[PDB]
Design an enzyme around this catalytic site. Structure first.
Site, PDB file in Angstrom:
ATOM      1  CG  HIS A 175     -76.648  41.962 -15.591  1.00 27.22           C
ATOM      2  ND1 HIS A 175     -75.869  41.772 -16.714  1.00 27.22           N
ATOM      3  CD2 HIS A 175     -77.864  41.444 -15.879  1.00 27.22           C
ATOM      4  CE1 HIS A 175     -76.577  41.139 -17.629  1.00 27.22           C
ATOM      5  NE2 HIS A 175     -77.795  40.936 -17.155  1.00 27.22           N
ATOM      6  CB  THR A 180     -73.217  38.616 -20.510  1.00 28.60           C
ATOM      7  OG1 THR A 180     -73.181  39.939 -19.973  1.00 28.60           O
ATOM      8  CG2 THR A 180     -74.240  37.741 -19.780  1.00 28.60           C
ATOM      9  CG  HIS A 236     -73.148  45.974 -15.216  1.00 29.39           C
ATOM     10  ND1 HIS A 236     -72.623  45.040 -14.353  1.00 29.39           N
ATOM     11  CD2 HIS A 236     -73.608  45.284 -16.287  1.00 29.39           C
ATOM     12  CE1 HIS A 236     -72.742  43.841 -14.891  1.00 29.39           C
ATOM     13  NE2 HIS A 236     -73.345  43.961 -16.062  1.00 29.39           N
ATOM     14  CD  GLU A 240     -75.792  41.244 -21.689  1.00 28.09           C
ATOM     15  OE1 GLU A 240     -75.585  40.783 -20.561  1.00 28.09           O
ATOM     16  OE2 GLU A 240     -74.880  41.554 -22.461  1.00 28.09           O
ATOM     17  CG  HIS A 269     -75.841  44.577 -20.442  1.00 27.95           C
ATOM     18  ND1 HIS A 269     -74.570  44.376 -20.941  1.00 27.95           N
ATOM     19  CD2 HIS A 269     -75.861  44.012 -19.210  1.00 27.95           C
ATOM     20  CE1 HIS A 269     -73.855  43.718 -20.042  1.00 27.95           C
ATOM     21  NE2 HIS A 269     -74.611  43.497 -18.979  1.00 27.95           N
ATOM     22  CG  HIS A 314     -67.256  46.814 -20.720  1.00 26.62           C
ATOM     23  ND1 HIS A 314     -67.862  46.072 -19.728  1.00 26.62           N
ATOM     24  CD2 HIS A 314     -65.939  46.854 -20.405  1.00 26.62           C
ATOM     25  CE1 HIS A 314     -66.960  45.725 -18.827  1.00 26.62           C
ATOM     26  NE2 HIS A 314     -65.786  46.191 -19.211  1.00 26.62           N
TER      27      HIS A 314
HETATM   28 ZN   LIG Z   1     -74.048  42.536 -17.291  1.00 22.82          ZN
END
Ligand SMILES: [Zn+2]
Length: 258
Positions: A117, A196, A92, A104, A94, A62
């Site tokens: 993050h 999240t 990591h 996010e 997104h 992911h």
């Molecule tokens: Zn994250």
């Protein structure tokens, strides 16, 4: 049929396996800058990353996690809204399928191209697994990415992604300095929230920096070459691995700055 970001298993489906998805302190959220209240009792953030020891980078299906040795107080977050000391375990990102989306958190509904993050756990709970079971277990430092000039300190990450294309793949990744990913200013918004990604546990003090970092189009394009899928499976690009903004409900976002 496990959770993901696809048509049939994306964020709007997660509540079926993880009912806390519809909970009272879910993340991310939209940050309404005009409603956020300056809190003069908030302290400056303390980011002490000088002794950080990175070990590995992992495609977990992911995102990709850059993992740190968290068996000692080496890379710690304290101050700000936090009580106590929180240890860096991984960071990591997104990101989107194109530059107009990917973050996010949003800022007055603005979406950034990506969001970093940096995940830390409260040392009073002994390790990460125990920390996520506590309402003040984690502190996540969120940093927005916009596309413009390259971020030199990101390039070592970008250049190893070819070696972890598919999910479950890992690579040695030592001596990476996460200070190279920070903006100039540590002005922030803060609120209580959640992971999240599933299990979406409501264990996070969110600290979202106001100043984005700039990364190049080439840098984010390489994020988008990663795969959600495992080795020898049909290729599905790892893009749009972001959860959209969730209801703020009974929460107030506080600002460290005027
Ligand atoms: Zn994250």
């Amino acid at each position: 049929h496990h959770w993901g970001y696809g048509k049939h298993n994306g964020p709007e489906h997660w509540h079926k396996d993880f009912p806390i998805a519809k909970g009272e302190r879910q993340s991310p959220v939209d940050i309404d800058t005009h409603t956020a209240k300056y809190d003069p009792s908030l302290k400056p953030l303390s980011v002490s990353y000088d002794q950080a020891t990175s070990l590995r980078i992992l495609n977990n299906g992911h995102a990709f996690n850059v993992e740190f040795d968290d068996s000692q107080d080496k890379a710690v977050l304290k101050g700000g809204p936090l009580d106590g000391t929180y240890r860096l375990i991984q960071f990591h990102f997104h990101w989107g399928s194109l530059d107009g989306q990917g973050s996010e958190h949003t800022v007055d509904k603005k979406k950034y191209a990506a969001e970093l993050h940096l995940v830390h756990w409260n040392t009073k709970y002994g390790d990460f697994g125990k920390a996520v079971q506590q309402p003040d277990g984690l502190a996540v430092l969120g940093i927005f990415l916009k596309v413009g000039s390259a971020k030199p300190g990101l390039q070592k990450v970008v250049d190893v992604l070819d070696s972890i294309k598919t999910k479950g793949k890992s690579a040695d990744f030592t001596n990476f300095d996460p200070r190279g990913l920070l903006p100039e200013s540590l002005d922030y918004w803060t609120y209580p929230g959640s992971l999240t990604t599933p299990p979406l546990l409501e264990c996070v003090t969110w600290i979202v920096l106001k100043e984005p970092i700039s990364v190049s189009s080439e840098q984010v394009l390489k994020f988008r070459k990663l795969n959600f899928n495992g080795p020898g499976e049909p290729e599905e690009l790892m893009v749009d691995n972001w959860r959209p903004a969730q209801p703020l409900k009974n929460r107030q976002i506080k600002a460290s700055f005027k």
